[PDB]
Amino acid sequence: AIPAFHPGELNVYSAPGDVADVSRALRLTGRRVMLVPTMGALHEGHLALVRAAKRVPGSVVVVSIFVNPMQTPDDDLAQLRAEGVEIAFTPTTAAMYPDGLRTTVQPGPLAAELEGGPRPTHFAGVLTVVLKLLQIVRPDRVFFGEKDYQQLVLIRQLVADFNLDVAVVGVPTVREADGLAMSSRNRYLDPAQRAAAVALSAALTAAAHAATAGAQAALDAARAVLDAAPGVAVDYLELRDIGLGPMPLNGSGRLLVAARLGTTRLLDNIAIEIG
Amino acid sequence: IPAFHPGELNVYSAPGDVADVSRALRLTGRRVMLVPTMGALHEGHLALVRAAKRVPGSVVVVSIFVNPMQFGAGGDLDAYPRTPDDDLAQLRAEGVEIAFTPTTAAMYPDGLRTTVQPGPLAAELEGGPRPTHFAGVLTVVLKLLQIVRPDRVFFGEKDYQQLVLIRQLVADFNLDVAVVGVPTVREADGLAMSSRNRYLDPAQRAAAVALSAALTAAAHAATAGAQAALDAARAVLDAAPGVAVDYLELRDIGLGPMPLNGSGRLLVAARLGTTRLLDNIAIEIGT
Numbered sequence: 317a318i319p320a321f322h323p324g325e326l327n328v329y330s331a332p333g334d335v336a337d338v339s340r341a342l343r344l345t346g347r348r349v350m351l352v353p354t355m356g357a358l359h360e361g362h363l364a365l366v367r368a369a370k371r372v373p374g375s376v377v378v379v380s381i382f383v384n385p386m387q388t389p390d391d392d393l394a395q396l397r398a399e400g401v402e403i404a405f406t407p408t409t410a411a412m413y414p415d416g417l418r419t420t421v422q423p424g425p426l427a428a429e430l431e432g433g434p435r436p437t438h439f440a441g442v443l444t445v446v447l448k449l450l451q452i453v454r455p456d457r458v459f460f461g462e463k464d465y466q467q468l469v470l471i472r473q474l475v476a477d478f479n480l481d482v483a484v485v486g487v488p489t490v491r492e493a494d495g496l497a498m499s500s501r502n503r504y505l506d507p508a509q510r511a512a513a514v515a516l517s518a519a520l521t522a523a524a525h526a527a528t529a530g531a532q533a534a535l536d537a538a539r540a541v542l543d544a545a546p547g548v549a550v551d552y553l554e555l556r557d558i559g560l561g562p563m564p565l566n567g568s569g570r571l572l573v574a575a576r577l578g579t580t581r582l583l584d585n586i587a588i589e590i591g
Numbered sequence: 592i593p594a595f596h597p598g599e600l601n602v603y604s605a606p607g608d609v610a611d612v613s614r615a616l617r618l619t620g621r622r623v624m625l626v627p628t629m630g631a632l633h634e635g636h637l638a639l640v641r642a643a644k645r646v647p648g649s650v651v652v653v654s655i656f657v658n659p660m661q662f663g664a665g666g667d668l669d670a671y672p673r674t675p676d677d678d679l680a681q682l683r684a685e686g687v688e689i690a691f692t693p694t695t696a697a698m699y700p701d702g703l704r705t706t707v708q709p710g711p712l713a714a715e716l717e718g719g720p721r722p723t724h725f726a727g728v729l730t731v732v733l734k735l736l737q738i739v740r741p742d743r744v745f746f747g748e749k750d751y752q753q754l755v756l757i758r759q760l761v762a763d764f765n766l767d768v769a770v771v772g773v774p775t776v777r778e779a780d781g782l783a784m785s786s787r788n789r790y791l792d793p794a795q796r797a798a799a800v801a802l803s804a805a806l807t808a809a810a811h812a813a814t815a816g817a818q819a820a821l822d823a824a825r826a827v828l829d830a831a832p833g834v835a836v837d838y839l840e841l842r843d844i845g846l847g848p849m850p851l852n853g854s855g856r857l858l859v860a861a862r863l864g865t866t867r868l869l870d871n872i873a874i875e876i877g878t
């Protein structure tokens with residue numbers, strides 16, 4: 317028997333089997349299932365993913381909230397209700413890993429680069445949990461923020477490599493009024509650090525416009541902006557092609573930056589067109 | 592959707608083609624059964640097909656793909672038997688409606704990029720000397736499952752460790768498929784059917800009966816306990832001309848981090864010349 321589903325209400329399920337059965341039932345009724353994976357602590361960045369999901373005709377939106385150990389619940393659920401989301405999937409660690417860590421996903425070599433520098437097993441954790449959520453929910457489309465661009469690219473590789481039948485949708489980064497990419501970590505910044513943190517986005521946008529003068533001009537313009545900020549320890553600043561391989565001589569690319577401000581690590585990235 | 596002629600064998604090479612046909616069939620109420628093979632089909636494979644065929648409303652998809660990722664150099668990959676004309680003929684005789692015969696390029700267009708990392712069981716038994724073998728197997732089976740999206744997938748008990756690892760894959764990635772283990776098909780003397788049996792000369796073929804003899808002796812000896820069962824198997828293997836034992840192990844049925852209780856599996860691997868043979872059997876202790 318299919319678990320109870322009340323249309324137009326927020327339906328919260330903690331058992332993987334329960335959301336699996338409801339999702340399957342709903343798709344048969346002519347809904348298109350949209351999945352928005354989160355770790356809770358929702359902000360406007362996450363709501364942008366939800367809104368993208370909602371606008372697909374026939375959509376029913378599943379938002380998962382799960383703090384993946386391998387990589388405010390009441391408030392989160394209120395935000396989802398306010399957005400008209402019909403399904404929240406809130407599993408426990410034990411429900412997701414009933415046999416502990418056993419079979420896992422091993423990413424390709426991109427996972428060792430950039431963010432994989434300090435955190436060499438982070439993306440194995442991410443792709444493992446994402447693969448599981450895809451299999452539990454079986455959505456037609458799954459939504460991720462462009463802010464975590466390397467994550468987004470690795471998920472596209474997961475989907476292609478394992479022949480997954482789901483469309484991956486990248487959603488543009490939501491930003492504060494001065495350009496700073498929205499992140500739960502931003503609140504940890506003291507006033508000086510918060511003022512200095514504007515250099516990430518300013519550096520990237522400066523580079524995007526400098527890029528008419530070529531790749532080197534774009535990189536140099538970004539480095540200059542970061543060089544004008546105090547207490548911003550740049551971990552990397554790299555221009556790559558859109559799949560995060562080596563940047564071609566001309567054409568489309570992505571510029572990525574990460575920096576530490578005190579104990580807080582921030583990331584940002586932007587589309588670049590060379591020439 | 593490419594053409595599907597029902598009641599005939601339809602052969603598709605493109606993953607997109609079989610995926611489209613499978614989806615179309617499932618949407619009209621047919622239940623899709625998948626039998627993954629590496630070809631060189633014998634009666635053991637046909638038992639899997641027949642098990643699949645008897646699921647009511649079933650449409651049977653047999654994949655044939657000699658998966659490069661589960662082989663290590665040199666050597667073994669080139670040496671694997673390929674008898675595609677016989678394979679397809681056998682599937683026609685069995686009334687299988689779909690054969691999926693993908694190319695290496697279609698399966699691995701990006702080489703080895705994202706892969707499946709099996710649990711600790713993949714390092715043991717068959718995996719000991721071949722530490723990447725089961726990552727190859729689990730990666731291809733995952734892909735086949737995603738392409739075909741069957742209701743049920745059929746594997747032989749002969750490769751018992753592989754069957755266990757596939758159940759792990761299915762559980763650990765929350766795959767919506769039932770895994771069906773099918774009992775080992777044997778020659779009249781007990782020898783487990785294998786595409787590798789073709790490499791036994793008449794003398795080696797005679798000697799090879801020792802594996803199944805040893806296992807069945809142990810299964811009956813087991814009323815007297817584990818030591819008795821193992822020593823009965825060892826005695827038979829020891830009496831066998833030119834059988835070189837790699838391992839003989841009695842484990843819990845899941846082969847995992849749990850001690851043997853009342854139900855186990857006895858597994859053997861042995862070399863007859865250059866041919867490595869496997870077999871296994873259910874064991875009940877004091878029963």
Ligand SMILES: Nc1ncnc2c1ncn2[C@@H]1O[C@H](CS)[C@@H](O)[C@H]1O
Pocket residue numbers: 353354355361362364365459460461462463464487488489490491497498499
């Ligand atoms: N400022 C932002 N804009 C867009 N998406 C964002 C974001 N901050 C986080 N996200 C997105 O939220 C998800 C959390 S698991 C992930 O897809 C991340 O990329």
Ligand SMILES: Nc1ncnc2c1ncn2[C@@H]1O[C@H](CS)[C@@H](O)[C@H]1O
Pocket residue numbers: 627628629634635636638639745746747748749750773774775776777783784785
């Ligand atoms: N003698 C036999 N009896 C039953 N199944 C067998 C078999 N020999 C091989 N198989 C089965 O055929 C498949 C080839 S990839 C695999 O599931 C193996 O376990």
